[PDB]
Amino acid sequence: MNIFEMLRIDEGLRLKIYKDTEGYYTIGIGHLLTKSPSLNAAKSELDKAIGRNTNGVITKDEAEKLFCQDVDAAVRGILRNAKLKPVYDSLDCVRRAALINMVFQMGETGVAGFTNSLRMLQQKRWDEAAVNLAKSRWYNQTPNRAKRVITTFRTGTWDAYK
Ligand SMILES: [Cl-]
Ligand SMILES: [Cl-]
């Protein structure tokens, strides 16, 4: 198991534009295209991201390419964020993946705001952090996924994902 496989399980893979859990136009492996309600705006963003007239559909390879970019960007966003980096630096390899997963789903700004949880993680107070992370809109809206990520932080293993 690794970050790529983990996110592929959490996000799925769809080759045609779809709406995410929040109703936003997305494609591929959780690649958000836009928060606008216009499908046209989405199709436009899509063609700009792929470099061709897609007509709303992409290939597996193209989806995997967006995915690569997106994982890379998440890690880079973490490393450049004053609030996140120290947390990430303090964690083991498995747990790092859990943090990347959250940033991928919610953005750096989104995660950077889980101040209290962040501190607990940094202190290695696993059970406490697990509890605190659960008190969030994230957990209430996407509980199955949140549970997997939270168990990952709690145990430092990939058990939520065999
Ligand atoms: Cl991009
Ligand atoms: Cl879920």
UniProtKB/Swiss-Prot annotation:
UniProt catalytic activity: Hydrolysis of (1->4)-beta-linkages between N-acetylmuramic acid and N-acetyl-D-glucosamine residues in a peptidoglycan and between N-acetyl-D-glucosamine residues in chitodextrins
InterPro entries noted in UniProt: Endolysin_T4_type, Glyco_hydro_24, Lysozyme-like_dom_sf, Lysozyme_dom_sf, Phage_lysozyme-like, T4-type_lysozyme
Documented effect of changing S117I: 500-fold decrease in enzymatic activity
Location (main, coarse): host cell
Gene3D superfamilies: 1.10.530.40
Any one Gene Ontology molecular-function term assigned to this protein's record: lysozyme activity
Keywords from the UniProt entry: Antimicrobial, Bacteriolytic enzyme, Cytolysis, Glycosidase, Host cell lysis by virus, Host cytoplasm, Hydrolase, Viral release from host cell
Chain positions recorded as substrate binding sites: L32, F104, S117, N132
Variant or mutagenesis effect after changing D20 to A/N/S/T: Complete loss of enzymatic activity
Effect in UniProt of substituting T26H: Facilitates transglycosylation more effectively than hydrolysis; covalently bound substrate
Cytoplasm keyword on record: no
Impact after mutating E11N: Loss of 84% of enzymatic activity
Any one annotated GO CC term: host cell cytoplasm
GO biological processes: cell wall macromolecule catabolic process; defense response to bacterium; peptidoglycan catabolic process; viral release from host cell by cytolysis
Cell compartments where the protein resides: Host cytoplasm
Activity dependence on pH, as recorded: Optimum pH is 7.3.
Family: Belongs to the glycosyl hydrolase 24 family.
Record's function text: Endolysin with lysozyme activity that degrades host peptidoglycans and participates with the holin and spanin proteins in the sequential events which lead to the programmed host cell lysis releasing the mature viral particles. Once the holin has permeabilized the host cell membrane, the endolysin can reach the periplasm and break down the peptidoglycan layer.
Name used for this protein in its record: Endolysin
